[PDB]
Ligand binder design. Structure first.
Ligand SMILES: [Zn+2]
Ligand SMILES: [Zn+2]
Ligand SMILES: [Zn+2]
Lengths: 65, 266, 168, 85, 196, 133, 49, 141, 43, 159, 559, 114
DNA sequence: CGATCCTC
RNA sequence: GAGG
């Protein structure tokens, strides 16, 4: 259920960062901590935003209609 | 010049690091506050959903739409719809965006803020263009679509302030620290053995002389010099978050001065 | 020595020393007659019952026996002078304060004491923790306590779990 | 039959909390129903606050019939009853 | 609720500027009371927090598994390695004044759960409405506009207070109340009242 | 009026009994062999070391809402370094002729013993403490 | 992610709650309380599977 | 292959169980004080070993971070509450016509997990959010 | 759900008690508060 | 046991005394045993006190017992409340329980008894024995929806 | 029972409760929607006509309004429908069912209602949001908690009915309870915690704060007190600004352990004319204590003055604390490397004592004293050494905790937690118990199948050596669960049993009341007591006071 | 459901004014100003500047209840100095400080390169 | 013959 | 059936 736009706590936009994050893990073969920092997610309120996001929309899209 | 003094340590397109010296803590804080809550911005405040065959709910989507940052550069030249003499909204008080998206491919169709389209007449104002900061130029994944999936909606973006809804916040986090040595004794450090060894010192300590143990506590000393870093969400540039922050505060003090004048008649 | 009685006599005294600004360096204007008969007459005015008959008079006498003990112990000649250092002005005020506060302390006819007692016991009973006891370390100090005991008592249990005789 | 004379009255000369509550109730209810007021309302409008003033200035023309368990009773006027509390 | 048997309701909401803030400018999403800790002895809550703070900083998952060798000390080392005081304490400033607090706040992430049963699904009020068929008494339930129960226990409290008339009113004017015709001879409700 | 007591004391011990900015001081007269002093000083505003020689003064001078210093031309009765204000709460006679006075300066306590205190220390809501050098 | 183990009776999901009982064909002796004439008793609750 | 085997309380009576594979049977001959107090092998007459002591627990309790650092009633209460929580109960929720369904908008996998949650599919179907919590006397609301 | 699908009931000397024999078989923590406390179990 | 006793100087002193604690009761026989203080013999079985020493002793022992359960918990209730309950059980002549066997069988109004337990069967024997209801009770006025002689209605208001 | 003793009622509301440091003790925050639902039948007099006509015109959806106007011939006019809804020309004698407005008396209750203090008359205060708000110092009489509890509201419909609530049932009238002849309300939580921290000798405040603190007191005289310090910086103490909340004519004296008029440890308490001389303010001063500020103020100044006191204390304390802060972290459960090492050795010596008594027991040298089994005596002994070790280990812990330790702070103020809590969290949990005895052999001759047959060792029978900080082992974990369960079971038993007890007592004593002859009597007129309480005195007006003739020496009595 | 509109924080209602001057009862030359639709952004800022005024005897502010967007400001001054003028000068001083800051930040930003 | 309060 |  899709990358939340903006970090709840602080407000820093996080909606534009999801796909870039997956590529950094996949292609670039980086660890989550360096990837989060590469995206400029310095505060832990922003790190938890992406690190703990579960993307259920992918599952939801798998349904036939 | 005279009163408050600024020293910009570092500056970027989306971040200013500066030292605000020769100030009152009331002022520095009231400025910090007004930057968070009261600088006017333009954000989607109305969505009319024509078609939604997505897996996401109407309001779920409309909620995220309000969170998409939109150009707010020439915002003071756009009215609050509440003051506009129009019936509802117009080009003098609102921006109208359009979102039409269809799952053409078998592969997942992604919906971005780039896909929002200004329909309104901007009358040559730098306003309403979705803020795009990602390297791929997409900026903000609004939604995802399958094959037969469709999404057709219309957005009325309006002027507002964070104090009414966080979506209208031009800034994210504002770093704020005064007296990195606790020379003022404004905090009492919790410890086990040695507070000094137990508490990490601020980068700001470099900028100040250490307390010097063989000196009595400066009782008379007051907090003046404030290490700040203001982050912009994008809608307004960093220089503008602080300049408009100052100007808004300055403006709301002037309204009190003017209120005193108005009640001084009959 | 410490017992629940109406009229906090100690406070009335501290109140008198503030109100009258008593200085522990000036000799009082009281007499033995003033203090002694003073307290004595106060006792005849601490009414609870009013019937002019012998039964009611003795009923009244008995009702205030304990309070008068406290009053006499507190308002003794040596104490009213060497301890409180009261003046005639401050002394008479204390006499009028006790009388009024005593009459304020009395129960009001209509007070539904039945429900009051039932609730006053029944509520703290709900607050009871550990159905067993705190003497749990010793296996000879095991006696029915708490809610089971209270149940034993109220039901007037013929066969109580821990019958025990204490011999002096 | 039954009664008790004005003389020889063993019940408290002091008005009870329940006597005060019921007396203030009956009066507040009369005031609220356009019954006349026996005192100068200094800007006062609340029926209860008025009944309180009427009590303070002892112009409440009521009589508490105090019953004893035998069935006998003692009559006490609102004016005679001492209102400490 | 936290994941440690610590249920609680929102008392009030403060916007970002009123909230206490960190020097990095981090603000809590939630503020729980210190007093909710001593009596409860739910130490794992405190540990979860510390671990979760380190997890988010390092971009690694926290091992909150039971019978393990994960120590509070172990975590506190890793947190200090990140430039935070080892025990989750943080220098915080008052949102109203911007003045530092004399006390350092135990801050950091903690898994919280949105529980069902929300004010709006519980709020009821009835100033007269539907009456039960047989008893002629207010109906039962918010989703029927029912009368709240003034049970024998509440009846007791009112006797204790000596509120004779309030008790008469709660049991007559509000709820029930009826007029019946009695025979002065037999004393039964037999009287065939041909009113008017 | 004016002064009610003025003497030079010698600090025996300094004690921070579970405190950071407060200390209980033990001192005695440099002149009178019987004259005692046990007082609470704010060691953050005025620090006190062992064997220090301090001048203690109790007055009642230079009632209504407190107006901020406003030193523009304001002249207060102090060539002193540390000044307090409190209330008298007990007058303990320590047998024969010895008398002790009790002062609380907002909870910072004082006990001064000797003999000649007499018609100078009243049960007064007054008393300003002044300490120099 | 559905795990099954339930039924759908009239379009309604039904769980059969596992029911606890003492096993049969188990020999068990019980010390019997003060008033009873029978000191101890040995029971068996014989069943057929 | 007879490396593992099924035991019921009855057979449990006749066997001696080691709690840890290593920590319950290597050998004998400085320590971490922070680490808890674990007794001694002492008994060595072992017939079995515990797969993992945390398996003494079930679904609800399996969700708790460090119950080994909590009072026992708090683990019972938490077990009751996780059944009042909100989150993705199933992926097909969009398709079911059920009486009352409560779905969390943005569920998050907890930053602190238990190995057993991997089998309970928690990080795939979460029931909560990693809120930045401050423990403080603020407005006192 | 998983939890509901691993539930136990006990109709009607110390049934409510967490017996020793329950180790590894029934969850020690997971029971309802009051009424069916210690009667309703979870595998 | 430790004991507070007046010394020759007048003041109270801790003088520890040897006391015997028992499993079982036979007050009648044990108190007549030589070498004891029959004046101080006690039992938690207040019924035995009621039987051997009389109603008043039973009442006192009953209070001591109720008191001890409240104090055991650390809790304190004012004397008069426990005093009132104890007297209530006591005034009958013997011991009357806080059960349907005790107070509910009392000479009290039929309608006020059925409000507790045995609702129907109390109202049945009320019709059979042809009982008259006083209607001066709380529960009876509660049933009748009238102002009870409780606090506020415990007196009349007249002109 | 369900239709006559009790029933469902009109003019009743319910919802989730929430705390409010800004509400008055005797107020209740009522949601605007609830206020809009519940009504008072007000008769039109010239005294109100103007306000009533206005309210009728405001209608049922705008708040200070009404629904229904009742005229002569009792016909109701529905203000939500009706063509003449905005017409209505009011008349005297007519009734206007107006919305519930500020300061109306209302019954406020928390079930179960085991107290007259569980039902209390509150001053209405109409507020936004959907919760009922209440003053934190009203929590205890109701036994409220803001964890999700709901509470009831009843509206008087008669002038005498609202007179009964205001004059008998009112919250300040309930401050001093006749249950235990002492207050039933007091300064709790953040306020209790902060009031200690505020009243420390070390705690000082300057002009800025002082002035704000002073203004925060509603009663405030408007006079700035002279700072306790007039040296390089004017500085007021916490004691100073809080004494502003204390009215004049208030005297309080205590004396704790080392309290000696010079109170070296700032212990005890002395308040003169309502100004704190010395003594840190905590639970003994400001809680619901028998000789506390609250018992005094109520008796001295009055209930309405005492009720104002809760607010005034709350307003300063809550403010100073909001600016001071106060937390609790995992670091508050940590104790010294040296301390831990010492707790460890304390437990090892208990393990040796338990081993030796065992070795002695096994040699047949252990001889039990009269009345008990050789086994019973051994068991009693073992349990003792182990319980001793937990207390000793925990005392070792409590002593290491600095005055800056947040848990130690909550214990010191008395706002939350006890010794056991510190001990179990920091040092050692201790021995587990099921039915008084330690963990039993549920398996043949063993507690778990990880033990050998016939093992009476601490570890074997439920001794939790570990602190919740260190963490519990699987065995320890299970045994704690076993103990835990038993506690939840009887919690469920107590609540069911005590509730029944309470009902029975109530039924048996219902009709007992003090008559016009001071005689305690039932409905039959039978005498229970000749003078209520054997003294015809009311419990609320009674306090433990020392009889100065009973004690001391004969020589001391003479002097 | 019972929640006010978030605009009610910054927008004046019908029959509602910004400032409401009220003469204080307890003390001479003291006044109590109710600031409608305002918070700690203005309350604290004004109070702190009012304290820099040597002719100001008292200056404090409070937000009686967090639901409502309003604050009360108390001002006491020297005989001859009217509080409205102390608040007048208070405000101007603030405006002057801000304008200087505005200028200085603007002069600094123009030197910065990024 | 009894067995805590609330509504769903 | 769920809530304290
Ligand atoms: Zn963030
Ligand atoms: Zn327009
Ligand atoms: Zn007939």
């Amino acid at each position: 259920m899709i990358v939340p736009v903006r970090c709840f706590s602080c407000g820093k936009v996080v909606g534009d960062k999801w796909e870039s994050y997956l590529n950094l893990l996949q292609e670039d073969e980086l660890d989550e901590g360096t990837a989060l920092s590469r995206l400029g997610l310095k505060r832990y309120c922003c790190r938890r935003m992406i690190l703990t996001h579960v993307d259920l929309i992918e599952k939801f899209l798998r349904y036939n209609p | 010049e005279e009163g408050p003094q600024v020293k910009i340590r570092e500056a970027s397109k989306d971040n200013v690091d500066f030292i605000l010296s020769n100030v009152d803590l009331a002022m520095a804080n009231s400025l910090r506050r007004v930057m968070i809550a009261e600088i006017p911005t333009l954000a989607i405040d109305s969505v009319e959903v024509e078609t939604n065959t997505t897996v996401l709910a109407d309001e779920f989507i409309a909620h995220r739409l309000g969170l998409i940052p939109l150009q707010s550069m020439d915002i003071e030249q756009l009215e609050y719809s509440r003051d506009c003499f129009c019936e509802d909204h117009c080009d003098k008080c609102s921006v109208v965006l359009t979102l039409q998206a269809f799952g053409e491919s078998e592969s997942t169709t992604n919906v971005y803020s780039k896909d929002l389209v200004i329909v309104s007449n901007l009358m040559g104002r730098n306003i309403g263009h979705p803020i795009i900061q990602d390297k791929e130029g997409n900026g903000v994944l609004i939604c995802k679509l399958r094959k037969g999936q469709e999404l057709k909606l219309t957005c009325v973006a309006k002027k507002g302030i964070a104090k009414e809804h966080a979506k209208w916040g031009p800034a994210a986090a504002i770093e704020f620290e005064y007296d990195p040595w606790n020379k003022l004794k404004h905090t009492d450090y919790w410890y086990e053995q040695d507070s000094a060894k137990e508490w990490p010192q601020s980068k700001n300590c470099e900028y100040e002389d250490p307390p010097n143990e063989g000196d009595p506590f400066d009782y008379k000393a007051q907090a003046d010099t404030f290490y700040m870093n203001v982050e912009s969400v994008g809608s307004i540039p960093v220089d503008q978050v602080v300049v408009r922050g100052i100007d808004t505060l300055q403006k709301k003090v002037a309204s009190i001065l003017l209120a005193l004048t108005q009640m001084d008649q009959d | 020595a410490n017992w629940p009685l109406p009229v906090n006599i100690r406070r009335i005294i501290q109140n008198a020393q503030q109100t009258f600004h008593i200085d522990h360096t000036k000799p009082s204007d009281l007499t033995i007659k003033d203090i002694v008969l003073g307290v004595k007459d106060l006792q005849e005015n601490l009414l609870v019952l009013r019937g002019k008959n012998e039964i009611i008079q003795n009923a009244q006498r008995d009702a205030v026996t304990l309070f008068c003990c406290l009053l006499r112990s507190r308002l003794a000649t040596r104490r009213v002078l060497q301890e409180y250092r009261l003046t005639k002005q401050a002394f008479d005020w204390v006499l009028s304060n006790i009388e009024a506060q005593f009459l304020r302390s009395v129960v009001h006819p209509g007070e539904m004491v039945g429900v009051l007692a039932a609730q006053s016991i029944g509520e703290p009973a709900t607050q009871m923790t550990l159905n067993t006891f705190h003497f749990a370390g010793v296996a000879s100090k095991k006696v029915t306590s708490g809610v089971p005991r209270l149940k034993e008592i109220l039901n007037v249990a013929k066969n109580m779990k821990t019958p025990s005789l204490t011999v002096y | 039959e039954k009664a008790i004379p004005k003389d020889q009255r063993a019940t408290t000369p002091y008005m009870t909390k329940y006597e005060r509550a019921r007396i203030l109730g009956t009066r507040a209810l009369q005031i609220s129903m356009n019954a006349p007021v026996f005192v100068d309302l200094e800007g006062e409008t609340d029926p209860l606050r008025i009944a309180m003033k009427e009590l303070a200035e002892k112009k409440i023309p009521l009589v508490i019939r105090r019953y004893l368990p035998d069935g006998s009773f003692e009559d006490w006027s609102v004016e005679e009853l001492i209102v400490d509390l | 609720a936290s994941r440690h048997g610590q249920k609680g309701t929102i008392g009030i909401t403060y916007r970002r500027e009123d909230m206490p803030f960190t020097a990095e400018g981090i603000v809590p999403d939630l503020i729980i009371n210190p007093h909710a800790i001593p009596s409860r002895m739910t130490v794992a809550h405190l540990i979860e927090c510390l671990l979760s703070k380190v997890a988010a900083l390092s971009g690694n998952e926290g091992d909150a598994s039971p019978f393990t060798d994960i120590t509070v000390e172990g975590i506190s080392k890793l947190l200090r390695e990140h430039g935070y005081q080892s025990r989750g304490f943080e220098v915080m400033y008052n949102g109203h004044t911007g003045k530092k607090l004399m006390a350092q706040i135990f801050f950091g992430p903690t898994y919280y759960q949105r529980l069902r049963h929300m004010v709006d699904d519980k709020i009821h009020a009835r100033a007269r409405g539907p009456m039960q068929v047989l008893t002629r008494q207010p109906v039962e339930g918010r989703s029927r506009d029912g009368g709240l129960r003034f049970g024998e226990m509440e009846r007791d409290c009112m006797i204790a207070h000596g509120a004779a008339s309030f008790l008469k009113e709660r049991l007559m004017e509000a709820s029930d109340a009826f007029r019946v015709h009695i025979c002065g001879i037999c004393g039964l409700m037999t009287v065939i009242a041909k009113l008017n | 009026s004016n002064t009610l007591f003025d003497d030079i004391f010698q600090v025996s011990e300094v004690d921070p009994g579970r405190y950071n900015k407060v200390c209980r001081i033990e001192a005695a007269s440099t002149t009178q062999d019987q004259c005692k002093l046990t007082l609470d000083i704010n060691v953050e505003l005025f620090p006190v070391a062992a064997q220090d020689s301090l001048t203690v003064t109790i007055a009642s001078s230079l009632t209504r809402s407190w107006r901020p210093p406003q030193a523009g031309d304001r002249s207060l009765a102090d060539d002193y370094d540390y000044v307090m204000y409190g209330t008298a709460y007990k007058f303990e006679e320590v047998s024969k002729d010895l008398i002790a006075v009790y002062y609380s300066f907002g909870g910072l306590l004082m006990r001064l013993e000797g003999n000649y205190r007499n018609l100078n220390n009243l049960k007064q809501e007054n008393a300003y403490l002044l300490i120099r050098r | 992610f559905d795990m099954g183990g339930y039924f759908i009776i009239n379009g309604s999901e039904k769980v059969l709650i596992a029911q606890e009982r003492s096993a049969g064909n188990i020999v068990q002796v019980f010390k019997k309380a003060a008033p009873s004439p029978i000191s101890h008793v040995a029971e068996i609750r014989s069943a057929l599977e | 292959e007879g490396l593992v085997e099924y035991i019921d309380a009855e057979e449990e009576e006749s066997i001696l169980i080691a709690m840890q594979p290593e920590d319950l049977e290597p050998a004998e001959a400085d320590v971490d004080p922070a680490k808890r107090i674990r007794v001694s092998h002492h008994a060595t007459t072992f017939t079995h070993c515990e797969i993992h002591p945390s398996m003494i627990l079930g679904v609800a309790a399996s969700i708790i971070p460090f119950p080994d650092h909590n009072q026992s009633p708090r683990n019972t209460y938490q077990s009751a509450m996780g059944k009042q929580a909100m989150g993705v109960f199933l992926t097909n929720y969009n398709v079911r016509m059920d009486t009352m369904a409560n779905i969390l908008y943005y569920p998050q996998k907890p930053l602190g997990t238990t190995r057993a949650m991997e089998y309970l599919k928690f990080r795939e179907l979460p029931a909560g959010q990693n809120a930045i919590v401050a423990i403080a006397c603020y407005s006192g609301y | 759900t998983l939890s509901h699908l691993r539930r136990t009931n006990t109709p009607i000397a110390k049934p409510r008690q967490l017996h020793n024999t329950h180790w590894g078989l029934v969850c020690p923590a997971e029971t309802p508060e009051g009424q069916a406390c210690g009667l309703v179990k979870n595998l | 046991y430790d004991r507070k006793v007046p010394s020759p100087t007048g003041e109270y002193v801790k003088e520890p005394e040897w006391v015997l604690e028992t499993d079982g009761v036979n007050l009648s026989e044990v108190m007549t045993v030589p070498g004891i203080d029959p004046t101080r013999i006690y039992t938690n079985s207040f019924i035995d006190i009621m039987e051997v020493l009389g109603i008043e002793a039973g009442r006192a022992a009953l209070y001591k017992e109720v008191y001890n359960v409240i104090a055991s918990d650390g809790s304190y209730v004012n004397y008069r409340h426990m005093a009132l309950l104890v007297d209530v059980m006591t005034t009958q002549g013997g011991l009357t329980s806080v059960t349907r066997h005790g107070f509910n069988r009392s000479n009290t109004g039929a309608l006020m008894r059925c409000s507790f337990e045995e609702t129907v069967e109390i109202l049945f024997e009320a019709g059979a024995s042809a009982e008259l209801d006083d209607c001066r009770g709380v529960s009876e006025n509660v049933i009748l929806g009238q102002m009870a002689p409780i606090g506020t209605g415990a007196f009349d208001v007249m002109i | 029972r369900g239709n006559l003793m009790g029933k469902r009622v009109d003019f009743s509301a319910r919802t989730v409760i929430s705390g409010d440091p800004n509400l008055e003790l005797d107020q209740v925050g009522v949601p605007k929607s609830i206020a809009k639902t519940l009504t008072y039948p007000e008769v039109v007099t010239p005294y109100n006509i103007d306000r009533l006509t206005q309210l009728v015109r405001n209608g049922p959806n705008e708040h200070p309004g009404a629904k229904y106007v009742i005229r002569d011939s009792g016909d109701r006019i529905d203000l939500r429908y009706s063509k003449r809804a905005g017409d209505i020309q009011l008349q005297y004698g007519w009734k206007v069912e107006r919305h519930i407005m500020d300061n109306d008396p209302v019954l406020f209750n928390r079930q179960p209602s085991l107290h007259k203090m569980s039902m209390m008359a509150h001053r209405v205060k109409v507020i936004p949001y959907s919760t009922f708000r209440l003053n934190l110092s009203v929590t205890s009489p109701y036994n409220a908690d803001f964890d999700g509890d709901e509470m009831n509201l009843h509206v008087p419909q008669s002038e005498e009915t609202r007179a009964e609530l205001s004059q008998l049932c009112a919250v300040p009238l309930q401050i001093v309870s006749p249950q235990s002849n002492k207050p039933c309300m007091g300064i709790v939580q953040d306020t209790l915690c902060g009031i200690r921290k505020l009243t420390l000798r070390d705690t000082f405040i300057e002009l800025d704060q002082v002035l704000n603190m002073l203004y925060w007191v509603p009663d405030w005289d408007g006079v700035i007190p002279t700072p306790a310090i007039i040296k390089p910086k004017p500085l007021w103490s916490g004691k100073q600004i809080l004494s502003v909340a204390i009215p004049n004519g208030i005297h309080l004296q205590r004396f704790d352990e080392g309290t000696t008029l010079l109170s070296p440890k700032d212990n005890g308490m002395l308040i003169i004319d309502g100004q704190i001389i010395f003594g840190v303010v905590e639970k003994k001063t400001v809680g619901s204590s028998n000789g506390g500020l609250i018992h005094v103020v109520t008796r001295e100044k009055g209930p309405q003055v005492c009720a104002k006191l809760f607010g005034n204390i709350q307003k300063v304390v809550n403010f100073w604390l909001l600016h001071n802060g106060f937390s609790t972290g995992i670091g508050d459960t940590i104790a010294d490397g040296p301390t831990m090492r010492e707790i460890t050795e304390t437990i090892a010596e208990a393990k040796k004592k338990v081993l030796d008594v065992t070795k002695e027991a096994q040699a047949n040298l252990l001889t039990a004293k009269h009345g008990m089994t050789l086994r019973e005596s051994f068991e009693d002994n073992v349990v003792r050494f182990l319980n001793e070790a937990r207390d000793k280990a925990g005392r070792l812990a409590e002593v290491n905790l600095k005055d800056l330790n947040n848990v130690k702070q909550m214990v010191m103020a008395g706002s939350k937690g006890s010794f056991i809590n510190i001990a179990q969290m920091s040092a050692c949990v201790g021995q587990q118990s099921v039915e008084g005895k330690r963990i039993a052999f549920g398996f043949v001759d063993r507690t778990l199948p990880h033990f050998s047959k016939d093992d009476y060792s601490p570890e074997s029978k439920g001794f939790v050596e570990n602190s919740y900080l260190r963490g519990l082992t699987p065995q320890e974990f299970f045994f704690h669960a076993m103990g835990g369960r038993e506690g939840l079971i009887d919690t469920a038993v107590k609540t069911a049993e005590t509730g029944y007890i309470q009902r029975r007592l109530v039924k048996a004593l219902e009709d007992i009341m003090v008559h016009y002859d001071n005689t305690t009597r039932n409905s039959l007129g039978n005498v229970i007591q000749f003078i209520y309480g054997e003294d015809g005195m009311d419990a609320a007006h009674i306090e433990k006071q020392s009889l100065d003739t009973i004690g001391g020496s004969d020589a001391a009595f003479e002097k | 459901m019972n929640a006010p509109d978030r605009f009610e924080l910054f927008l004046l209602g019908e029959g509602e004014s910004k400032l409401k001057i009220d003469p204080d009862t307890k003390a001479p030359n003291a006044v109590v100003i109710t600031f409608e639709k305002e918070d700690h952004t203005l309350g604290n800022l004004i109070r702190a500047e009012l304290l820099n005024d040597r002719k100001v005897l008292f200056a404090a502010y409070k937000v009686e209840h967090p639901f409502f967007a309003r604050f009360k400001l108390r001002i006491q001054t020297t005989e001859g100095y009217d509080p409205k003028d102390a608040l007048k000068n208070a405000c101007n001083s603030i405006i002057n400080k801000l304008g200087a800051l505005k200028t200085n930040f603007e002069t600094e930003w123009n030197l910065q390169t990024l």
